[PDB]
Scaffold this active site. Sequence first.
Site, PDB file in Angstrom:
ATOM      1  N   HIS A  38      -9.371   1.323  -2.411  1.00  0.00           N
ATOM      2  CA  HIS A  38      -7.854   1.142  -2.059  1.00  0.00           C
ATOM      3  C   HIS A  38      -7.113   1.011  -3.329  1.00  0.00           C
ATOM      4  CE1 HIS A  38      -4.234   0.436  -0.229  1.00  0.00           C
ATOM      5  NE2 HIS A  38      -4.428  -0.663   0.584  1.00  0.00           N
ATOM      6  N   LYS A  88     -10.040   7.252   0.157  1.00  0.00           N
ATOM      7  CA  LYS A  88     -10.311   5.598  -0.157  1.00  0.00           C
ATOM      8  C   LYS A  88     -11.921   5.441  -0.047  1.00  0.00           C
ATOM      9  CE  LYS A  88      -5.929   3.513   0.609  1.00  0.00           C
ATOM     10  NZ  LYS A  88      -5.071   4.862   1.133  1.00  0.00           N
ATOM     11  N   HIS A 130      -3.940   7.263   5.237  1.00  0.00           N
ATOM     12  CA  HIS A 130      -4.062   6.135   4.713  1.00  0.00           C
ATOM     13  C   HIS A 130      -5.500   5.525   4.658  1.00  0.00           C
ATOM     14  CE1 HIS A 130      -2.809   1.814   3.693  1.00  0.00           C
ATOM     15  NE2 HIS A 130      -3.068   1.657   5.004  1.00  0.00           N
ATOM     16  N   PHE A 153       0.589  -3.199   4.184  1.00  0.00           N
ATOM     17  CA  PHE A 153       0.832  -4.424   4.488  1.00  0.00           C
ATOM     18  C   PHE A 153       2.357  -5.000   4.434  1.00  0.00           C
ATOM     19  CE2 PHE A 153      -3.622  -5.230   4.532  1.00  0.00           C
ATOM     20  CZ  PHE A 153      -4.246  -4.870   3.493  1.00  0.00           C
ATOM     21  N   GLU A 185      -3.920   4.974  13.268  1.00  0.00           N
ATOM     22  CA  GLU A 185      -3.774   6.077  12.671  1.00  0.00           C
ATOM     23  C   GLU A 185      -4.101   7.240  13.179  1.00  0.00           C
ATOM     24  OE1 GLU A 185      -4.798   6.139   8.513  1.00  0.00           O
ATOM     25  OE2 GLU A 185      -3.471   7.706   7.845  1.00  0.00           O
ATOM     26  N   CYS A 243       0.561  -1.145  -0.055  1.00  0.00           N
ATOM     27  CA  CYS A 243      -0.095  -0.017   0.003  1.00  0.00           C
ATOM     28  C   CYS A 243       0.669   1.294   0.116  1.00  0.00           C
ATOM     29  CB  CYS A 243      -0.862  -0.201   1.144  1.00  0.00           C
ATOM     30  SG  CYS A 243      -1.686  -1.550   1.694  1.00  0.00           S
TER      31      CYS A 243
HETATM   32 MG    MG Z   1      -2.929   9.047   2.008  1.00  0.00          MG
END
Ligand code: MG
Lengths: 414, 414
Positions: B342, B337, B308, B401, B319, B169
């Site tokens: 994603h 996202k 993320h 990951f 996060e 990612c």
């Molecule tokens: Mg980002």
Amino acid sequence: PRGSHMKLNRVVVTGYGVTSPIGNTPEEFWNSLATGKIGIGGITKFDHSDFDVHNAAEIQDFPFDKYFVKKDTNRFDNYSLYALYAAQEAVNHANLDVEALNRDRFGVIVASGIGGIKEIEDQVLRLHEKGPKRVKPMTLPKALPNMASGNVAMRFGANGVCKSINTACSSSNDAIGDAFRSIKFGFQDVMLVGGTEASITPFAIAGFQALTALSTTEDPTRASIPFDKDRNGFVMGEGSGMLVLESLEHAEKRGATILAEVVGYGNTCDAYHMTSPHPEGQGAIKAIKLALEEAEISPEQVAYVNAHGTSTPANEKGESGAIVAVLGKEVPVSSTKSFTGHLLGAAGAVEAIVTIEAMRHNFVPMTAGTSEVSDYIEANVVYGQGLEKEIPYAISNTFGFGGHNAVLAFKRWE
Amino acid sequence: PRGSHMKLNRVVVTGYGVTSPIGNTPEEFWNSLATGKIGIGGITKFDHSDFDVHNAAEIQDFPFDKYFVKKDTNRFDNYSLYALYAAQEAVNHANLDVEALNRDRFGVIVASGIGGIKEIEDQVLRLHEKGPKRVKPMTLPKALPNMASGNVAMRFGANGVCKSINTACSSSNDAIGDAFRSIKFGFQDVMLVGGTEASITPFAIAGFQALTALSTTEDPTRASIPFDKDRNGFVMGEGSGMLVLESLEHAEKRGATILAEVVGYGNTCDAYHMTSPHPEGQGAIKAIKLALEEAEISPEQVAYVNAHGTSTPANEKGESGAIVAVLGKEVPVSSTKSFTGHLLGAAGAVEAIVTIEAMRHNFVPMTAGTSEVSDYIEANVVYGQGLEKEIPYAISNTFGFGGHNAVLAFKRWE
Ligand SMILES: [Mg+2]
Ligand SMILES: [Mg+2]
Ligand SMILES: [Mg+2]
Ligand SMILES: [Mg+2]
């Protein structure tokens, strides 16, 4: 505030580890080179009766029990096992105490060209035989090409940089170059760096056969013959090399034993053909020159070239041309893919070990198998037997599928 | 000789390109964000009747005809098509004349987490249905994850650096960071950089389902809900983002239009779990701090965080904790996202475009879908509607990951 200027650091090699078709310790690995014992033979990892290629360079004695237990196969494809073994061996060799380091300044790069391709093939088949519910939970943790790097970081508690680089045959030359640049420019103090490949599988062999990239020569002693007039494709190998790189200051402060210095890195792109190297080695010339410029050495100071040397017509024609253009006709050149096969993403790391070991032994390993070098090849190709000589500086080339050229320059240590 | 010291350079963004589930130009892409139009819906690329996951964020209108012809599918998997389209759009946007450049100082990085995984699945099946002789010659040129980078280099004549990075990612956050560092330290003057993914396939969906990583929520408007109490896994997207980065000197000398400045990059490793992020965001904290230190800014100067934010319980708990620890409870945070799905190896590049566009429009895009943020989440999560505000500096996170953390810091331009 950050400075306007960065004061450059020197970068040294303090240890390395290897699993390969010619040995699983530096001593075994070197002994094979010094005695002329190749690692190519008939394929045993799968039934190759329907294929046109029947040879490979396998690891047939992987020391699984040294570090692993049966349950580890649930978590790790062989591509990760090989990297974890080589990384532990490198840490041991360096006498690196990972519990005494600044773990934020300790990083890992594990290159791979294809990742856990056995896992992918086998779980694709399970999907289509049994349905999606039966795909194994650990499929992607085992398969994805970045996972070996994360696995190595977890084993050693490396909290710094962690990445994988993919430039096909150049992957671990670029990995070592990237780690070198990280330390040189002050971002990290210690890096575990190299590459790994475990692609002796029905799918990957079928894919390279379809590309017409593999030797179909039946005699395993005549299949990997870099620079030879009879060459007709590469022989696939497998395994991993891993190196410990440190800043000079970090290594000396802890009393490390220093094995070599990394002094230059050149990376260019042919932007020419998707899989064939530029026929006159034009991108290779520029990559060699960049490495020498960064290392502050003249061409005449290079005492050995570990060639890319995959055993293809097009490769060695251009590669010999590039070496002659920059360095001339006297510098000794050998390809150890004649012994190891083509380790793909692991080739640059294992070849960096060859090059360092050559400098430490005052010995240029031969190109095994080769007997009759093509008439137009002007480089000083070493074949028949290796050469005793002082090697104060050396380079190692990789010129990979996708046009990726990478050259590393090493300096012998004091 | 080389200097003892390197004088650092500034690095600017002069153009970008995108193909994604919410648009295939920056104008279309931004319009979707500004109007609240998500790209998640029912899967159409394969029969998903036997799966537990029935939604994805697809590109259902890819502008194939703009640059390609039918024969290009013989040579390129969709993962390369997406990158080539986005790269041409970025070159156009930057008004970069590739025939006027020093091509040795022009490089390419195209990140990908999985590469041409459709090609792999389909040719594995062909192998096992028909035998090895029927595997297509272009299998590996189409499949291998480095090939998109080499393809982009060939299209534009980039003879400099050419590589792919794989950090799952984080891949294109690390790509942009690496290109930034190359230009900052004087190795290249112009880089085309980003990432690409085309993994909405039976195999890749089955693999992420087996990992329990995907939302099984049937309603496509409630499946990608970052920070929401009901979140239960990611929704897979596809596509590519590509950016033109230049040294400040190169951009100004040619009269380029400058869109933003890249000012910092942080990359750390959890070295904690193979697929789950550290539960308190410990590696994420250190990555954020590294980016701010390199950019020479204080926490209070950060005016937007593009999270993320994959829509997993564990991710957004850690996060949010990391963002609050370093930056506090006032800085606006959103995850796009919620709109794009994603994008895996392409996530960092498309999110860099989001972040730049937010700075240029004085507007923080909302987190779509989310309604009720978990009680323990203390970050200022923007949901319901976006926020009008001046954004002089911003960051974009990816926490992938394998434990790979990457943060980019951007500065608004003059
Ligand atoms: Mg980002
Ligand atoms: Mg042996
Ligand atoms: Mg070599
Ligand atoms: Mg649209």
